[PDB]
From Swiss-Prot, chains A, B:
<protein>
    <recommendedName>
        <fullName>Capsid protein VP2</fullName>
    </recommendedName>
</protein>
<comment type="subunit">
    <text>Interacts with capsid protein VP1 and capsid protein VP3 in the mature capsid.</text>
</comment>
<comment type="function">
    <text>Forms an icosahedral capsid of pseudo T=3 symmetry with capsid proteins VP2 and VP3. The capsid is 300 Angstroms in diameter, composed of 60 copies of each capsid protein and enclosing the viral positive strand RNA genome.</text>
</comment>
Swiss-Prot record, chain G:
<comment type="subunit">
    <text>Interacts with capsid protein VP0 and capsid protein VP1 to form heterotrimeric protomers. Five protomers subsequently associate to form pentamers which serve as building blocks for the capsid. Interacts with capsid protein VP4 in the mature capsid. Interacts with protein 2C; this interaction may be important for virion morphogenesis.</text>
</comment>
<protein>
    <recommendedName>
        <fullName>Capsid protein VP3</fullName>
    </recommendedName>
</protein>
<comment type="function">
    <text>Forms an icosahedral capsid of pseudo T=3 symmetry with capsid proteins VP2 and VP3. The capsid is 300 Angstroms in diameter, composed of 60 copies of each capsid protein and enclosing the viral positive strand RNA genome.</text>
</comment>
Amino acid sequence: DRIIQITRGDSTITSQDVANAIVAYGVWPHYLSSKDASAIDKPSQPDTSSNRFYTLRSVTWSSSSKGWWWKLPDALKDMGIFGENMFYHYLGRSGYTIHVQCNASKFHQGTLIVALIPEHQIASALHGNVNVGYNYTHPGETGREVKAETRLNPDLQPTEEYWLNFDGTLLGNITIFPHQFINLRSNNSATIIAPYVNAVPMDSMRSHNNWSLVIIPICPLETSSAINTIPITISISPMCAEFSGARAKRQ
Amino acid sequence: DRIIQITRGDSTITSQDVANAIVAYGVWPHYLSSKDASAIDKPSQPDTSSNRFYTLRSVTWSSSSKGWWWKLPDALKDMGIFGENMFYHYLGRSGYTIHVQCNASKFHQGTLIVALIPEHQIASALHGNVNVGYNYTHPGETGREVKAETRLNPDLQPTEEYWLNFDGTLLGNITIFPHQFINLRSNNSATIIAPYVNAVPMDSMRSHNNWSLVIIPICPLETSSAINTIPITISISPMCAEFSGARAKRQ
Amino acid sequence: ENYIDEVLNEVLVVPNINSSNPTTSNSAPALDAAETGHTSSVQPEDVIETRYVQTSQTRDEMSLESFLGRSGCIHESKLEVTLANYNKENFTVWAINLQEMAQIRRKFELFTYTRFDSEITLVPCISALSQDIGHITMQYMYVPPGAPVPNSRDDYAWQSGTNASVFWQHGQAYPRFSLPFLSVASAYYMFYDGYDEQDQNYGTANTNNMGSLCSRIVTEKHIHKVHIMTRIYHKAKHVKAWCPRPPRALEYTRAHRTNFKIEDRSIQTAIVTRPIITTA
Amino acid sequence: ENYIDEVLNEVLVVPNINSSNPTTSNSAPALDAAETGHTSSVQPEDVIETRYVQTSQTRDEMSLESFLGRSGCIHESKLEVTLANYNKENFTVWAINLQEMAQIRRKFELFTYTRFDSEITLVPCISALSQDIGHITMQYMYVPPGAPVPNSRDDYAWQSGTNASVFWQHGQAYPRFSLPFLSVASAYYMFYDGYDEQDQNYGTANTNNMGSLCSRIVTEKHIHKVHIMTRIYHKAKHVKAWCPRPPRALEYTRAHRTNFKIEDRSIQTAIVTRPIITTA
Amino acid sequence: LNYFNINYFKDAASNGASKLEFTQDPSKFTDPVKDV
Amino acid sequence: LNYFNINYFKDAASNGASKLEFTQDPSKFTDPVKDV
Amino acid sequence: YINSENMYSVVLQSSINAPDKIFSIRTDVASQPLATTLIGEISSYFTHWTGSLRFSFMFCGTANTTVKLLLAYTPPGIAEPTTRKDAMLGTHVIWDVGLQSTISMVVPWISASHYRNTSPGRSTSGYITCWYQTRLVIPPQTPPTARLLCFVSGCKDFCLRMARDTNLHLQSGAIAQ
Ligand SMILES: CCOc1noc2cc(OCCC3CCN(c4ccc(C)nn4)CC3)ccc12
Ligand SMILES: CCOc1noc2cc(OCCC3CCN(c4ccc(C)nn4)CC3)ccc12
């Protein structure tokens, strides 16, 4: 009963220590209905070739790591058919199952917060008339590390202040967002299912990110073990993904 | 009643002088049934994003032109979602509506044969132990012109003998294949609908071409007009296209 | 009622010609457009005043089963028997094709795909090169893809533990046996517009690989030099075929390829030239 | 309704693949413990979203009866005929084993115990060493344990008063006959973990002793030197077997023993080496 | 009159030549007609 | 259609190949289950 | 490792933090390495191939050792996947080692034609490739390296046809009486 198996595509995920799973905002993902629709063309629904688990490049968690984030649909930009479907149409909508995985030993301790936050509009790094540049909120699968270094082009950079949720809001009220905690003594995986959420029936996969996945460790990773450094891996599967207004491929 | 309008995708074609239309082998295209199937995974059926009219680069018909051919699915290699779906899976199956278009004046005369032939395995240009090279039967949207020139790599080339149907068979028995004639005094368009046809439920879109479209003029284009040279254009729409065994993209 | 109707060979009948009358009308059945890709619908009675004739003729013989259902030679294997310790040699191997003899090849190549069970019939003949013959027994073993291929008159594979072998000895009548339709797909491919995984070997080469027919002389070392020529014959039973193609116009060059070109020879169809078109 | 269903070879069918759907649950069918000695229960539909496919395939050919029910060579007896008063010699004797020819031996050794009736088929061939052959008749007699064993082409035992003998003469077709399952126990032993009363001869040696197959040339003294090689073939009919064992991995050394070791030769399985395991 | 036929063998393929059944076109070669 | 079969001989063993009867496992190789 | 028992296990390292391949296998069943196995040897007695294959994996490491692996079957018409991304785009199972040692994944029968050849030689049935989803993590004072075992069987799906002699065994000399 701490087991979970989720099958999505041709893909199946397994975890032997999980804490339940969370369904965002209490609503399971669905295809867009006739009542709510706007775009009058027939959507394209790739089904199994699209709604499947895409797993991104892993990140490394150390004694020093103070947080990371990714943006969706962005992180999936280059992933398979979901990716290609993303730039061939104006519009798309999708829900996701997000499965974050980090394992350790009964001899390590650490705690991650895994939050999926809607319309996460982050804050500029500096004062005055700056904003954030397109490229910096569209990292692809690699995401943003919080780095103490000085950076390329700072007037365009986002704040590195993670305990401010990057948005100028207190971390630790970060809960009213769909979330789980990965706490090594207790679990191993985190799992979140989300429905499309947006004030419009379908939006641009290119110019707008509906969700941001942000994981910042609120309990620092401590061990006496030889492996004092462990990977966190993100796999996310789109669900009920549909696209419309097809044209040529945007670059 | 010589009018035709065929709508496929977001695409609609129109022709005001056509001769009926032909359905290949008397069978309309369909999706692959449970009884006939082999591959046990759920196919992906792009619907409107895939089954739509793709129109290729046009060719020029002159006093000297002795013929041309294209191969399917090959010609669609680079076309939109049908293309991309082609290399992301092992297997695919599709039917097509082929619409060949050439217009002129009541003051021109000429006659084309438009034939869609199944498993058109062409013949090597020279004698002895030659065969035809992959690249030469996979031209993409440009197709093969019959050219009287000497060619790059001749041991790998296909025959240029068009009146031999390229296969060592008499042109003019070329009829037992689904076909129409474009004859300028009479029509303007040719239209052919074909069902999947193959001795297997789905095959490799990459290594096997189910159909070849071949148009060779059996009546030479004559005019007293200033425009003594006219274009032929091919548009073809896949129909009930499905793919399975998805993996990464073959190059 | 079909033990009878096919004993005089009458199921599958040809229509009668009806009487016809002088036509005067806006209906022009003789006038169509062949541009449609459709063959004309006109019948004798449409363009000429015809009498009533009751047609007794029959299409039975024209059926796919009648046409493919006659055996013809698909391979000739000559075994020249040497005595150089006799065991190092003296075996046939043949990769199995309908493609090496033109007469049956042309017939099946009338269609794109074909499906049927096969009746193989053997006609072995011993050409005697010594004063005599003695007792010649032969073995023919079918060696499907992957089965161990015999490398010597010797080797274990003629044990034929699970393979099918058939034996012939001088004076025994022509061996025969049946095969079930063997393809891995729904039909055999007479033509293939594709290549292998390696993007090579265009054509039928890829499709039907039946493995090989292997022959050996089984009688142990002896003194008479002989040659054994076993000719292989093939009837199609239980037949369907699809997608008729035009018939091969030119001599066959090579198996599994449509190549027609030949060295220092004009390319020659079966059409025959006239002096002038106003004279037949 | 079973004259029909087995004429197209359809009794014994393979299950269909059902459609399957995205799973999210505490039920982990992919997760088991192979420590139990139990093979996993997982099916395609459990770990992947599958479509409905109606499976027409058939296990008939995979039945024990299909697999053992093909004849293959179990012995080759050569009779070199001498004329040194002709009666002192010129007979085969063979102790009867399925164990001297590897191909069928490997198959039956797939099981620990086997039971079945046998069809023995003979393929005699006369190798002519003189200018000619003449009239060769042969006799094959089954000589069960305890029956008098012939010591000369001569001796009375070919009278075959109660024994079974079968005759072949040149030009006659391949002899054949059937045997009823002959063991003294409920099944034949393919392997035996025990010895004789004397604590000797480990293995199958002890179990199945069928006695011997004895051959003689029966035609009386004559002038042509010949060799006669009669090959013995064996089909299993009416078969059951129990307790499958892993298949023989190495060449066979000796009959009735599992000994695999060979002199001055590396011990060689059929496995094939790779350079490195990250590449196939 | 008429004639006698039994199959003597266990397998489909052993059986002799098949019986004939009507041409029953459909006209799919000569007239595959989209509007008839 | 179907096919004809008679046994021409007095002894069991003379008879030809046996008929096939269902796999009907029980799962005794794959799952010999002491608590199922 | 050839004639030992070690031919039958693969070794995992705590030394590696990375998306590294561990091993790969041709998926055709009469193929090497799997020809030697029950299902292979038997398939090798027929010329025709079809069904789904069940690959089960048992983790033999310390009770306190943990890893997450990716197991992937990449269907034919493409090359053996060279990277984790490339592999994962196909049919896969992410396996989490925990109380139950074992996991079974399956390569669906996915193929052009209803049957395949047991000795294809040029054509492939696809590959199965094993990678590191995370890393092999260990406590203090426990072996740094852990082994992994691999099994095959057929599913309800599976069938063979056209019986032929086996290619995995031969008779060189004569057999002693
Ligand atoms: C112990 C006896 O074994 C045999 N002796 O002679 C034999 C002959 C055999 O083939 C049967 C007829 C087959 C030939 C294969 N063939 C094809 C297939 C594809 C193409 C493109 N062209 N021809 C289709 C029908 C099989 C076995 C034996
Ligand atoms: C006048 C003809 O007499 C015979 N000619 O050739 C013959 C062949 C005969 O054996 C029939 C098959 C038997 C062989 C004995 N065999 C076994 C038994 C145990 C083991 C461990 N391995 N093989 C089981 C089946 C019997 C009689 C004749």
